[PDB]
Amino acid sequence: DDFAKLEEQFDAKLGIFALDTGTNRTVTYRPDERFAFASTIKALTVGVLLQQKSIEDLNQRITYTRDDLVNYNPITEKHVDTGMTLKELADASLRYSDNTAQNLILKQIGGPESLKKELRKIGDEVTNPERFEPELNEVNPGETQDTSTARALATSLQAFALEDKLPSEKRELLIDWMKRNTTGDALIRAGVPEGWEVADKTGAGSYGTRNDIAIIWPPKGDPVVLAVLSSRDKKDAKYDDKLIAEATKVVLKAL
Amino acid sequence: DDFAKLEEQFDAKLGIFALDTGTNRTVTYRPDERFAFASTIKALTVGVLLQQKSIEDLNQRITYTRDDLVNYNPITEKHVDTGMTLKELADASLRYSDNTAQNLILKQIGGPESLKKELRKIGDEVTNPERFEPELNEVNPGETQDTSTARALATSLQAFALEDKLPSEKRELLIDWMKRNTTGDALIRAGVPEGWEVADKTGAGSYGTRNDIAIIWPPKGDPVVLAVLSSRDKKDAKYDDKLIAEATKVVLKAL
Ligand code: NA
Ligand code: NA
């Protein structure tokens, strides 16, 4: 198997689950092994937000302070004195992986416990959110807090983006934001053939954790749901995006 | 494995594909091996019919003669003088496996050729309908005519009954008919625990081909799509429903 060779090449552990919704053909590799989900959780968080809010509710202006700012706030730190609407916060969270935006949206839906409850409701019995950004990124081997699996993350993404968990109008909003993600050019997007459309959400955490979950659309055909997770054995280890791009190539080849 | 043992005991070949839609967990065994689909095709045919006709169109009365009757017409024979509406015909085809009903419906949708085209349009590139009832049941080893695989049949059933290939209103019509099927008590239904709901369509063909495709709802949880196909080596070989009931038990345990 090619995935094992990639693990050797990049000295990392891989977690993969891909599902061609048109044929029910799958590609898996350690699909049920837990990995810190890191920022990929931002996609599922907006999914839940869209479940509880009407489109007009998203125009609601949210105010916050420099006090509310965490470690990575590309968009939010530029509007502290003006506040941002929920819609703008969802945009910043998904497309720029803005940590404060994720925290503000998390508070809007009830916190991590409420997020977990809502996920259990849609059938996700694996994803275990417990903290806010950025501490959620610090997970030690063996711990299950703030972790999930490639199969669970792909399935929950599929539930919100392709299934009936959300009305079409809201599904479209989520897909549009993710299609326009600015942080994943070197990951799944780098591993698919040209002409293929990608909607993804990246993540990076401790122990060199580097993830990307996506819905990919071949030129002609049904979407493919893909979750590629990875981690290394050193807490301070550095990741290599090439690992995800290569893993994606194998998946495409396989499918 | 358990499936290999069942094949030896019953001197048969098993084709199995099961998918838990809530977790994307699957159970497979020769999922891509071709088997004559036999009467399981009746469920796919109704799916295409509901795609073309409106709920009103279903009341469209269809008239036929004793000439239109084939080898197995439990319902259509007792209605040759008054005709039957498309809805009653779909009912007869799905719940009683009425051969004349299937043929009349096939004609309604344009014949085997149109059915195949329609299936190709929803992503099914495997199912190969070519004939009418009852000839379609006669398939020789090596032929692809009127054959499909467990994976394709399950996926196509899921598309019509669980996916947005049909408006909720029509999906429930199909599910209702299949839930009240009268021909499969000794098959998948005999292999599920108490409290589990089943919507299935049976099939029997030459070479001892005995199939059952279904959607199963556990007491609590998302539906499971399951296709259990089987065949023997001798043209006139007899089938045993116990094989399917037993195979279903393994699938459930695995899930
Ligand atoms: Na980073
Ligand atoms: Na029979």
PDB file of N, CA, C and O in Angstrom, chain B residues 17-48:
ATOM      1  N   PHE B  17     -23.422  -6.090   0.141  1.00  0.00           N
ATOM      2  CA  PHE B  17     -23.021  -4.711   0.346  1.00  0.00           C
ATOM      3  C   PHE B  17     -23.988  -4.082   1.332  1.00  0.00           C
ATOM      4  O   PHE B  17     -25.195  -4.036   1.089  1.00  0.00           O
ATOM      5  N   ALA B  18     -23.456  -3.615   2.454  1.00  0.00           N
ATOM      6  CA  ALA B  18     -24.283  -2.969   3.461  1.00  0.00           C
ATOM      7  C   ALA B  18     -23.627  -1.650   3.820  1.00  0.00           C
ATOM      8  O   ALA B  18     -22.406  -1.554   3.901  1.00  0.00           O
ATOM      9  N   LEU B  19     -24.443  -0.629   4.027  1.00  0.00           N
ATOM     10  CA  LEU B  19     -23.925   0.677   4.387  1.00  0.00           C
ATOM     11  C   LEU B  19     -24.773   1.296   5.485  1.00  0.00           C
ATOM     12  O   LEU B  19     -25.982   1.412   5.344  1.00  0.00           O
ATOM     13  N   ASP B  20     -24.137   1.656   6.594  1.00  0.00           N
ATOM     14  CA  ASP B  20     -24.832   2.325   7.686  1.00  0.00           C
ATOM     15  C   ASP B  20     -24.703   3.804   7.319  1.00  0.00           C
ATOM     16  O   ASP B  20     -23.627   4.387   7.426  1.00  0.00           O
ATOM     17  N   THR B  21     -25.794   4.403   6.868  1.00  0.00           N
ATOM     18  CA  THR B  21     -25.749   5.792   6.443  1.00  0.00           C
ATOM     19  C   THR B  21     -25.393   6.764   7.557  1.00  0.00           C
ATOM     20  O   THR B  21     -24.948   7.875   7.291  1.00  0.00           O
ATOM     21  N   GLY B  22     -25.573   6.346   8.802  1.00  0.00           N
ATOM     22  CA  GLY B  22     -25.261   7.233   9.904  1.00  0.00           C
ATOM     23  C   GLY B  22     -23.783   7.326  10.209  1.00  0.00           C
ATOM     24  O   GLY B  22     -23.318   8.338  10.720  1.00  0.00           O
ATOM     25  N   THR B  23     -23.031   6.287   9.872  1.00  0.00           N
ATOM     26  CA  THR B  23     -21.609   6.267  10.176  1.00  0.00           C
ATOM     27  C   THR B  23     -20.690   6.004   8.989  1.00  0.00           C
ATOM     28  O   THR B  23     -19.468   6.107   9.114  1.00  0.00           O
ATOM     29  N   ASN B  24     -21.279   5.669   7.846  1.00  0.00           N
ATOM     30  CA  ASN B  24     -20.516   5.349   6.645  1.00  0.00           C
ATOM     31  C   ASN B  24     -19.656   4.102   6.839  1.00  0.00           C
ATOM     32  O   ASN B  24     -18.628   3.915   6.192  1.00  0.00           O
ATOM     33  N   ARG B  25     -20.096   3.252   7.756  1.00  0.00           N
ATOM     34  CA  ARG B  25     -19.431   1.994   8.016  1.00  0.00           C
ATOM     35  C   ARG B  25     -20.077   1.045   7.018  1.00  0.00           C
ATOM     36  O   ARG B  25     -21.280   1.130   6.760  1.00  0.00           O
ATOM     37  N   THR B  26     -19.285   0.144   6.460  1.00  0.00           N
ATOM     38  CA  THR B  26     -19.802  -0.797   5.485  1.00  0.00           C
ATOM     39  C   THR B  26     -19.448  -2.241   5.803  1.00  0.00           C
ATOM     40  O   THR B  26     -18.544  -2.523   6.582  1.00  0.00           O
ATOM     41  N   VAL B  27     -20.194  -3.154   5.198  1.00  0.00           N
ATOM     42  CA  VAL B  27     -19.944  -4.581   5.333  1.00  0.00           C
ATOM     43  C   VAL B  27     -19.985  -5.029   3.880  1.00  0.00           C
ATOM     44  O   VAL B  27     -20.983  -4.820   3.192  1.00  0.00           O
ATOM     45  N   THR B  28     -18.888  -5.601   3.399  1.00  0.00           N
ATOM     46  CA  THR B  28     -18.842  -6.041   2.014  1.00  0.00           C
ATOM     47  C   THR B  28     -18.324  -7.468   1.869  1.00  0.00           C
ATOM     48  O   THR B  28     -17.568  -7.961   2.700  1.00  0.00           O
ATOM     49  N   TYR B  29     -18.769  -8.128   0.810  1.00  0.00           N
ATOM     50  CA  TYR B  29     -18.353  -9.482   0.490  1.00  0.00           C
ATOM     51  C   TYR B  29     -18.725  -9.665  -0.987  1.00  0.00           C
ATOM     52  O   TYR B  29     -19.907  -9.754  -1.315  1.00  0.00           O
ATOM     53  N   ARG B  30     -17.715  -9.712  -1.860  1.00  0.00           N
ATOM     54  CA  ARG B  30     -17.917  -9.816  -3.317  1.00  0.00           C
ATOM     55  C   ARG B  30     -18.936  -8.739  -3.690  1.00  0.00           C
ATOM     56  O   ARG B  30     -19.905  -9.011  -4.401  1.00  0.00           O
ATOM     57  N   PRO B  31     -18.714  -7.490  -3.242  1.00  0.00           N
ATOM     58  CA  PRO B  31     -19.644  -6.397  -3.532  1.00  0.00           C
ATOM     59  C   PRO B  31     -19.745  -5.993  -4.988  1.00  0.00           C
ATOM     60  O   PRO B  31     -20.739  -5.404  -5.396  1.00  0.00           O
ATOM     61  N   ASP B  32     -18.715  -6.308  -5.764  1.00  0.00           N
ATOM     62  CA  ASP B  32     -18.674  -5.935  -7.169  1.00  0.00           C
ATOM     63  C   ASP B  32     -18.757  -7.096  -8.147  1.00  0.00           C
ATOM     64  O   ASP B  32     -18.358  -6.977  -9.304  1.00  0.00           O
ATOM     65  N   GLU B  33     -19.276  -8.219  -7.679  1.00  0.00           N
ATOM     66  CA  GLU B  33     -19.448  -9.371  -8.544  1.00  0.00           C
ATOM     67  C   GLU B  33     -20.863  -9.308  -9.113  1.00  0.00           C
ATOM     68  O   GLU B  33     -21.817  -9.004  -8.403  1.00  0.00           O
ATOM     69  N   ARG B  34     -20.993  -9.582 -10.402  1.00  0.00           N
ATOM     70  CA  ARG B  34     -22.299  -9.526 -11.042  1.00  0.00           C
ATOM     71  C   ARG B  34     -23.174 -10.744 -10.761  1.00  0.00           C
ATOM     72  O   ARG B  34     -22.695 -11.878 -10.721  1.00  0.00           O
ATOM     73  N   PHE B  35     -24.457 -10.477 -10.551  1.00  0.00           N
ATOM     74  CA  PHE B  35     -25.468 -11.496 -10.301  1.00  0.00           C
ATOM     75  C   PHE B  35     -26.654 -11.011 -11.097  1.00  0.00           C
ATOM     76  O   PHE B  35     -26.785  -9.813 -11.326  1.00  0.00           O
ATOM     77  N   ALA B  36     -27.516 -11.932 -11.520  1.00  0.00           N
ATOM     78  CA  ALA B  36     -28.731 -11.562 -12.232  1.00  0.00           C
ATOM     79  C   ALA B  36     -29.523 -10.822 -11.151  1.00  0.00           C
ATOM     80  O   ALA B  36     -29.643 -11.314 -10.030  1.00  0.00           O
ATOM     81  N   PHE B  37     -30.048  -9.645 -11.464  1.00  0.00           N
ATOM     82  CA  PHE B  37     -30.783  -8.909 -10.452  1.00  0.00           C
ATOM     83  C   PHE B  37     -32.197  -9.428 -10.233  1.00  0.00           C
ATOM     84  O   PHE B  37     -32.790  -9.214  -9.178  1.00  0.00           O
ATOM     85  N   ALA B  38     -32.716 -10.145 -11.221  1.00  0.00           N
ATOM     86  CA  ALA B  38     -34.059 -10.697 -11.157  1.00  0.00           C
ATOM     87  C   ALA B  38     -35.070  -9.623 -10.740  1.00  0.00           C
ATOM     88  O   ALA B  38     -34.916  -8.461 -11.105  1.00  0.00           O
ATOM     89  N   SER B  39     -36.085  -9.993  -9.963  1.00  0.00           N
ATOM     90  CA  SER B  39     -37.114  -9.036  -9.577  1.00  0.00           C
ATOM     91  C   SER B  39     -36.699  -7.850  -8.715  1.00  0.00           C
ATOM     92  O   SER B  39     -37.507  -6.967  -8.462  1.00  0.00           O
ATOM     93  N   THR B  40     -35.453  -7.806  -8.260  1.00  0.00           N
ATOM     94  CA  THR B  40     -35.040  -6.661  -7.467  1.00  0.00           C
ATOM     95  C   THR B  40     -35.150  -5.411  -8.342  1.00  0.00           C
ATOM     96  O   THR B  40     -35.342  -4.304  -7.842  1.00  0.00           O
ATOM     97  N   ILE B  41     -35.043  -5.603  -9.657  1.00  0.00           N
ATOM     98  CA  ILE B  41     -35.126  -4.503 -10.615  1.00  0.00           C
ATOM     99  C   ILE B  41     -36.463  -3.755 -10.521  1.00  0.00           C
ATOM    100  O   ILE B  41     -36.548  -2.578 -10.867  1.00  0.00           O
ATOM    101  N   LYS B  42     -37.498  -4.436 -10.038  1.00  0.00           N
ATOM    102  CA  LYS B  42     -38.814  -3.826  -9.914  1.00  0.00           C
ATOM    103  C   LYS B  42     -38.806  -2.578  -9.027  1.00  0.00           C
ATOM    104  O   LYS B  42     -39.565  -1.638  -9.267  1.00  0.00           O
ATOM    105  N   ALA B  43     -37.948  -2.560  -8.011  1.00  0.00           N
ATOM    106  CA  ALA B  43     -37.878  -1.398  -7.130  1.00  0.00           C
ATOM    107  C   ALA B  43     -37.234  -0.218  -7.862  1.00  0.00           C
ATOM    108  O   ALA B  43     -37.667   0.928  -7.709  1.00  0.00           O
ATOM    109  N   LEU B  44     -36.203  -0.505  -8.654  1.00  0.00           N
ATOM    110  CA  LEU B  44     -35.514   0.533  -9.415  1.00  0.00           C
ATOM    111  C   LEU B  44     -36.432   1.080 -10.506  1.00  0.00           C
ATOM    112  O   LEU B  44     -36.411   2.272 -10.799  1.00  0.00           O
ATOM    113  N   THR B  45     -37.240   0.198 -11.093  1.00  0.00           N
ATOM    114  CA  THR B  45     -38.171   0.579 -12.156  1.00  0.00           C
ATOM    115  C   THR B  45     -39.219   1.548 -11.624  1.00  0.00           C
ATOM    116  O   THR B  45     -39.553   2.524 -12.290  1.00  0.00           O
ATOM    117  N   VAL B  46     -39.742   1.274 -10.429  1.00  0.00           N
ATOM    118  CA  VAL B  46     -40.735   2.156  -9.811  1.00  0.00           C
ATOM    119  C   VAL B  46     -40.061   3.494  -9.477  1.00  0.00           C
ATOM    120  O   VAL B  46     -40.670   4.552  -9.604  1.00  0.00           O
ATOM    121  N   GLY B  47     -38.802   3.441  -9.055  1.00  0.00           N
ATOM    122  CA  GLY B  47     -38.084   4.657  -8.744  1.00  0.00           C
ATOM    123  C   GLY B  47     -38.034   5.569  -9.958  1.00  0.00           C
ATOM    124  O   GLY B  47     -38.277   6.769  -9.852  1.00  0.00           O
ATOM    125  N   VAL B  48     -37.718   5.006 -11.119  1.00  0.00           N
ATOM    126  CA  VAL B  48     -37.644   5.791 -12.343  1.00  0.00           C
ATOM    127  C   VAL B  48     -39.031   6.299 -12.741  1.00  0.00           C
ATOM    128  O   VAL B  48     -39.172   7.422 -13.219  1.00  0.00           O
TER     129      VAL B  48
END
